[PDB]
RNA sequence: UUGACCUCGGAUCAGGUAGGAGGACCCGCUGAACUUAAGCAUAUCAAUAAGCGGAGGAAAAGAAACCAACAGGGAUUGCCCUAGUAACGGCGAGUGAAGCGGCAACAGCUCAAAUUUGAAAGCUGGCUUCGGCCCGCGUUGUAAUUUGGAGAGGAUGCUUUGGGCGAGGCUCCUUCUGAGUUCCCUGGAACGGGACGCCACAGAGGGUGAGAGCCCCGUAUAGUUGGAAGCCAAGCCUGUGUAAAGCUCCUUCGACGAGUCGAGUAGUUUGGGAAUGCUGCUCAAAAUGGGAGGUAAAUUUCUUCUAAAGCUAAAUACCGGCCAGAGACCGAUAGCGCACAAGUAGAGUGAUCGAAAGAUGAAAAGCACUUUGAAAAGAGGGUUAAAUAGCACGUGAAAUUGUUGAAAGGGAAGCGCUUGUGACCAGACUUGCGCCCGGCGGAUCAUCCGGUGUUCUCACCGGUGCACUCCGCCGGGCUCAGGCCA
RNA sequence: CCGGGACCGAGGACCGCGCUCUGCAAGGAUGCUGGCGUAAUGGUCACCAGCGACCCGUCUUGAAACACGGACCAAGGAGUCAAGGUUUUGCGCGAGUGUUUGGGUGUAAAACCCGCACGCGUAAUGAAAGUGAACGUAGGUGAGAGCUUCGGCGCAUCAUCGA
RNA sequence: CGUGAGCCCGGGUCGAACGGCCUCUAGUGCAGAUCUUGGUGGUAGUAGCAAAUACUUCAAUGAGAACUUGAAGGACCGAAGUGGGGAAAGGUUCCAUGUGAACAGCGGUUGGACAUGGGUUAGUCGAUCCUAAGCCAUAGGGAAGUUCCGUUUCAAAGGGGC
RNA sequence: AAACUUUCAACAACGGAUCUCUUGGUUCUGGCAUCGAUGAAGAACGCAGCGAAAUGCGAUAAGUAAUGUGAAUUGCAGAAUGUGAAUCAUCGAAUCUUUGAACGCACAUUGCGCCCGCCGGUAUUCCGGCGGGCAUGCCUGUUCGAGCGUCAU
């Protein structure tokens, strides 16, 4: 149960915030868990997904398909994965939108900023574990 | 509640002088009779007095502390001397206190 | 007797904010206590007797202490509001008993008062020394210096040998005589001065 | 809102040969013009007898009757048949009323939810907690839209003494669903008789069961009530020797023969 | 002639200020009628609506020309009570306070009336090298001192003070936080069902292809990074008395607000139509004087205050603005007029009036290609879990309509009771129980022994039974009970 | 006394009244037999037949008639809330009673706790000043439920005479 | 199944929530109100589509031609016009291409419709300037005030030169 | 017999009830005090590669700077991306057309001016444009004055 007076348990307000969130908020909303190898490597459970990541789909009809993220379409809250497409009437290929919580990140598109994010999350997790221990 | 009302059943079938600037605090004087006089004594001490374990003492009752200004004379008193301090007293109340062996003292 | 002939619905006041207002008052009281600590949250008030004949049996807290009370207790009128004492210049002491009770109250407060120096390094002779600034303190003067005995004791025991004789002629007759004399003050004075004038005329 | 149905200018068209005498919206050029207004039978009109906030929402109850009801609920909580009749799973409970040692709850002994859950399973409230866990359902109606989405059964109520047991057990028991906690000095009838039905399952601490008498002695103006019946066993009264020895002989049986 | 004062002017002079918006609440002014009184000029509605002026985060009020009559209370405001009371009121409908008392919150002060007269000690502005210097205001009075609680003058001997650091704490944004996407079934998709776990100071809420504590955001508590600006504050350094300040006593002195108070009259207002306030007009004060003491007047007393100058937080209000949290509220004819490019579209010269209108699907996968048509479209064939979801789109009622099937009908139909015909149907029944034989398959037959529980004499469990005893099955035979109509 | 016909079978061990007494026609039906075992009985719907049968609501007066509303369908649509009385019902306490203006406390509009005042009640009467309720087992007489030691005691209440 | 208001089940359609029992609560039950809003009939393929004299032939375009176009005829307005231009008012209706539906009470290939583009050139024409009837500031005076009167005044109301 | 009219049934129409949903109302509660001549509220006109509206913005125009985050936006087309994307968040620096209390005079006009500078066109003279200014009441000071109002000489 929530205790803080600044926290609202209103379904209407929560749904309005979710479906009218700005793009920077939708980035954090569009987060995906890491694989077990990456979790044990980085001490991080989940990160916001971005283009260039390698994902495995673990829910839905396209389960166990693996590929690189080609687009993070934040306006419909979906991502596009390589070879995870369908055929239209005409036979052309159109991508199928997958929610990021239905996938697991198997390889990270890594640079200085992602390394900084992982470092802050890992340091915070160890600090909390040491304080509560 | 609405469900218990008869309407739900009926659904389908329809001198002297004038006193300017009166102040009641002038005329405040509550009265108590003598048959309730012993109730103002605390209970245990009252039982001792009525049984007769206090033959050399007399209780002194201030009516103004209990909120009464006049001692009226309805009822009868036991033969116990009681000092009563009151602002007002009726003649019969004073007479019955004197027969009981006490005194009515006047205060302001 | 229903007074609903005006537009009463325009000015109906409900009180659904009663618990919220109590919470607000409690928060303000906490903030005031924290700002004034270690001083008590309220000032010292005197003991006064309620006016009119209905309420003169009972004592209560007044506004502030009189200048005569402060002078008799030895507290200057300029120091008094700065050490938690309320001062009232309108009230007078018409009788000795209330004056004595309030002077005793002020002396008890001054005996229980701890006074910290204005500068820590330079305490003065009127200030509490550092080995006496440490004691258990109170924060509510309305509780610690309240009205202890508001009414007179309603029950007292005396020996039977000390029972008073009483007013001669009876208490009822004494009351009737007092009323009759009060109603006949002026008539007897007119008769007396007329008799004196007649005696002066025909001496 | 007090202005609803009345933010419009509408005048009746009078007695005539065509239309009913409802007030109609003036003007033209839109669908609203000429349509009825202000009536409770009209679309977009004022309701009959609009609801006001100065309705009497709160009920003043005598403090003596509140304390009497709390005492009756506490007495019904010590009756094991009523616990079963109120739906509680108490078949594995060792004794009613269930009193646990205050050493098992005092301080930070059950400040963790795992420790509190382990204590409940050890003392036997586990089936009742599991009943609450399995009883979760989605509410029928507009309560889902209005913030009341789920319903579940009520579990045990742990009564503790804040002076000796502390208050970290409240945090320890907070996350277990259906499990409630209460100080011994602030007992709530809304918890002791949920829904107006008697027989709440209560887990007591030894400190709370020690301060219960002091709590009911400290209540100024209230004493524990005297019952109008001294012995409640009607069978024992009726089949006592004192009553049966003075009775007239039976004038019939439970079944009567049909004479004609 | 020259200059100074006083009064009145000019300047695109130097520097400032006001207007308008908003107006829920606040301070004033002005001011109805419907209504209720049988009607109605008193009255009521109502000292309200509309109209006008002026503020703020609150405003206003406020430190007694008070209340009282007591053993006296002691600025203002608000709540409870006083109290539907005292009182007012045609022909009565009605109206209606206050002191005390409990509480919330409390906080006190500034001028005018005095000569600094051994020294205008005061202040705006300009220029500055920031040290000051000028031009002025002002003696028709700017500082210090005094405000009735007093104070001024003395006497008296003791007490009081200015600056600078400051540990630490608080307020606000920022970095970070626990646990399954394990296995099986249904399903287009598990967030469903089942099994095994884990977290919990977090089982609030939301999302994700169906009901998710452990997939994601968040949620709980301690903290933990980084920054800004304030506030509080334990203590610690220093100057000390040039000056200011308090207390005590006292011969004496002790200024205190005028077209104002008050009176008459008129209007309005009030519970104060004998005791209310305000305004206009007329008259017009005093120095123990004046006001008040709810019945007019004279005389003698008494008790309370000290008007005609001014400031001041809190508790109180808040249909406006900004931010936030909730509900036994409404669920698209409801809820605000407006859930939508709604004060929009539209109408009116104008003031103003003022709607209708939400929902494919998880995902557009929104129908490739062939064929018939001028096309719209149709037909195949496709997508989808479903097109019985085709941008006329969830579900898809009734009125009303088409086709198909059945029936009736010589100037109404419809309805009740009872048959009949046709069409279409719900039950019931299918065998059960008990004996007598025969054949199988087993010993949870009776008694006894030990343990355990109980209702304290009843049971269960382990041994014992050795098959004329028990329990099921399979064939017969017999009795009984079995459905509908007679 | 003896025939002929119609309709009906309520109840569910025994008990009772009786008689014509191995039993019975005596406090309510059994026995025997046949066909069928399914649309056969039964039911619903449509229609024909015989008989029956004004169109509803409203208004009016005594009543009809007149008059008024009604093309059809869906959804909406009208004795409610507050204050104040009064009678009755249930409940707590009871010569007292009322925590919730307020304060304390809290898991925080909840629940729990606290008390000064105050309201109503405990005394009335009078315009007011004022005064203020026991002659008596709180009286006598006649009833009166109930109890009784069977002499009486006598609730509530009523009538009457007293204080 | 229930006397009844109603309750329950089967079959079909459908796609995400809902119900029994005991208490609590109310914006709680419709045939009428010339009721409100929305929708739909009979009437009924009916009344009607009859003022302004009037149309015809061939060819082309086109799925389709009385009301499109070209030619050929026949007529009307008859200079107070059915002509050529403007003021008010409208605002792109103007021009060229193209066009499904809707609209043009019949049709329509046509259109003031719909879609995309284009088009308005001034020292000399007007506005702009002047004053008319009239209106608004200033001085000043009213009014509680929003504001009213006042337009030459009871104003130190300004030009020029040496 | 059919047709027609009516009744009943299945399917199909018409229409949008019912059910389920809800980025919306409604009511309560808590916190806060912040508009404008340093030009507000309001109005008009513009601004996107491809917009009519809603939204945002002002000729620096669906925006600039700065701080933070850290890889998009998306209907199409085209490009940019560690000073670094973004229809992102924050926001202390700016820009801010014509108006409006609206202020040079006017305004049913994109009308007519005055003062001081600058720019361009051959330009000391002419013509356009730009920059800074020119409203009213009132206060304080400055400076220039008027009056046999009045003082001294």
Supply the DSSP string of chain B, one letter for each residue: -GGGSHHHHHTT-------SS--HHHH---EE-STTGGGGS-HHHHHHHHHTS-SSEEEEEEHHHHT--EE---S---S---EEEESEE-HHHHHHHHHHT-EEEE--
**Resolution given for this structure, in angstroms:** 2.6
Experimental method: cryo-EM
What residue of C is the nearest CA neighbor of B24?
Answer: C54
Helix (H, G, I), strand (E, B) or coil at D52: coil
Which alpha helices (DSSP H) does C37-136 contain, by range?
52-55, 67-73, 96-112
Angstrom distance (rounded) from CA B87 to CA B104: 10
Beta bridge partners of B71: B32, B89
Task: List C-alpha distances in Å: A69 to A27, A76, A83.
Answer: 14, 15, 10
Query: Which partners does chain B have (≥3 C-beta pairs < 8 Å)?
Result: C
Q: b/e map of C148-165 (b: 16 or more CB within 10 Å)?
A: eeeeeebeeeeeeeebee
What residue of A is the nearest CA neighbor of D143?
Answer: A11
Angstrom distance (rounded) from CA D104 to CA D169: 10
- DSSP for residue A5: T
- DSSP for residue C76: -
Angstrom distance (rounded) from CA D71 to CA D68: 5
Q: Which helix (H) or strand (E) holds D113?
A: helix D113-123
| Parallel/antiparallel/unpaired status of strands D157-160 and D202-205 | parallel
- DSSP for residue C80: G
Task: List C-alpha distances in Å: D143 to A11, A103, D139, D148.
Answer: 12, 34, 7, 5
Helix (H, G, I), strand (E, B) or coil at A32: strand
- What is the CA D185 to chain-centroid distance, rounded? 19
Q: b/e map of D145-183 (b: 16 or more CB within 10 Å)?
A: eeeeeeeebbbbbbbbbbebbbebbbebbeebebbbbbb
| Beta carbons within 8 Å of C82's beta carbon, 6+ residues apart | none
Angstrom distance (rounded) from CA A112 to CA D205: 57
Helix (H, G, I), strand (E, B) or coil at D151: strand
C35/E167 CA-to-C1' distance in Å: 20
Q: Which helix (H) or strand (E) holds A120?
A: helix A112-132
Helix (H, G, I), strand (E, B) or coil at D183: strand
Q: Is the CB of D150 under 7 A from strand G?
A: no
D90 CA to chain A: closest CA distance, Å? Answer: 27
Residues of B in contact with C172 (CB under 8 A): 89-91, 94
D102/H149 CA-to-C1' distance in Å: 106
Q: Which helix (H) or strand (E) holds C49?
A: strand C47-49
Residue nearest to nucleotide E294 (CA to C1'): B21
What residue of D is the nearest CA neighbor of A9?
Answer: D147
- DSSP for residue A67: E
For the beta carbon of residue C125, count every other beta carbon within 10 angstroms: 4
D144 CA to chain A: closest CA distance, Å? Answer: 9
Residues of C in contact with B96 (CB under 8 A): none
């Amino acid at each position: 149960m929530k205790v803080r007076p600044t926290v609202s348990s209103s379904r209407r307000k929560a749904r309005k915030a979710h479906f009218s969130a700005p793009s920077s908020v939708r980035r954090v909303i569009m987060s995906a868990p890491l694989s077990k190898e990456l979790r044990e490597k980085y001490n991080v459970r989940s990160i916001p997904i971005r283009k260039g990541d390698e994902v495995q789909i673990v829910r839905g009809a396209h389960k166990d398909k693996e590929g690189k993220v080609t687009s993070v379409y934040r306006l419909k809250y979906v991502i596009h994965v390589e070879r995870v497409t369908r055929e239209k009437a005409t036979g052309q290929t159109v991508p199928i939108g997958i929610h990021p919580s239905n996938v697991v990140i198997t390889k990270l598109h890594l640079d200085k900023d992602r390394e900084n994010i992982l470092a802050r999350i890992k340091a915070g997790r160890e600090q909390v574990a040491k304080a509560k221990g | 509640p609405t469900r218990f009302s008869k309407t739900r059943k009926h659904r389908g079938h329809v001198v002297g002088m004038r006193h300017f600037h009166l102040l009641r605090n002038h005329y405040w004087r509550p009265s108590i009779n003598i048959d309730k006089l012993w109730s103002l004594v605390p209970s245990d001490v009252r039982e001792q007095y009525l049984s007769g374990q206090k033959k050399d003492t007399a209780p002194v009752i201030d009516l103004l502390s209990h909120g009464y200004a006049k001692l009226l004379g309805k009822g009868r008193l036991p033969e116990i001397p009681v000092v009563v301090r009151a602002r007002y007293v009726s003649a019969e109340a004073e007479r019955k206190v004197k027969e009981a062996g006490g005194v009515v003292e006047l205060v302001a | 007797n229903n007074h609903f002939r005006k537009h009463w619905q325009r000015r109906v006041r409900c009180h659904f904010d009663q618990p919220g207002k109590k919470v607000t008052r409690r928060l303000a009281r906490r903030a005031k206590a924290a700002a004034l600590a270690p001083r008590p949250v309220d000032k010292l008030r005197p003991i006064v007797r309620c006016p009119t004949v209905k309420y003169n049996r009972r004592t209560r807290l007044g506004r502030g202490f009189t200048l005569e009370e402060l002078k008799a207790a030895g507290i200057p009128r300029l120091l008094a509001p700065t050490i938690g004492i309320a001062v009232d210049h309108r009230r007078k002491n018409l009788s000795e008993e209330s004056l004595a009770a309030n002077v005793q109250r002020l002396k008890d407060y001054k005996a229980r008062l701890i006074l910290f120096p204005r500068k820590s390094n330079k305490p003065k002779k009127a200030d509490t020394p550092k080995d006496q600034q440490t004691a258990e303190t109170t924060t509510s003067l309305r509780t610690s210096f309240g009205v202890e005995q508001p009414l007179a004791p309603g029950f007292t025991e005396i020996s039977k040998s000390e029972i008073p004789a009483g007013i001669e002629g009876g208490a009822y007759r004494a009351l009737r005589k007092a009323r009759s004399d009060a109603r006949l003050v002026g008539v007897r004075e007119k008769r007396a001065k007329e008799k004196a004038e007649a005696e002066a005329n025909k001496k | 809102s007090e202005k609803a149905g009345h933010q419009t200018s509408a005048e009746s068209w009078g007695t005539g040969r065509a239309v009913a005498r409802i007030p109609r919206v003036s003007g033209g050029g839109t669908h609203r013009a000429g349509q009825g207004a202000f009536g409770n039978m009209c679309r977009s009109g004022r309701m009959f007898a609009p609801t006001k906030i100065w309705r009497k929402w709160h009920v003043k109850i005598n403090q003596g009757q509140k304390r009497f009801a709390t005492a009756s609920a506490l007495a019904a909580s010590a009756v094991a048949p009523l616990l079963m009749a109120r739906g509680h799973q108490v078949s594995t409970v060792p004794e009613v009323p269930l009193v646990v040692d205050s050493a098992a709850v005092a301080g930070d002994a059950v400040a963790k939810t795992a420790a509190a859950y382990k204590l409940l399973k050890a003392i036997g409230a586990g089936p009742d907690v599991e009943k609450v866990k399995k009883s979760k359902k989605l509410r029928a109606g507009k309560g889902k839209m209005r913030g009341r989405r789920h319903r579940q059964r009520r579990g045990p109520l742990i009564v503790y003494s804040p002076e000796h047991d502390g208050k970290e057990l409240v945090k320890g028991f907070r996350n277990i669903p259906g499990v409630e906690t209460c100080p011994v000095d602030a007992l709530n009838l809304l918890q002791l008789a949920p829904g107006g039905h008697l027989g709440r399952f209560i887990v007591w601490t030894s400190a709370a069961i020690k301060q219960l008498d002091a709590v009911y002695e400290s209540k100024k103006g209230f004493f524990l009530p005297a019952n109008i019946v001294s012995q409640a066993d009607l069978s024992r009264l009726i089949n006592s020797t004192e009553i049966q020895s003075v009775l007239r002989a039976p004038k019939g049986e439970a079944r009567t023969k049909r004479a004609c």
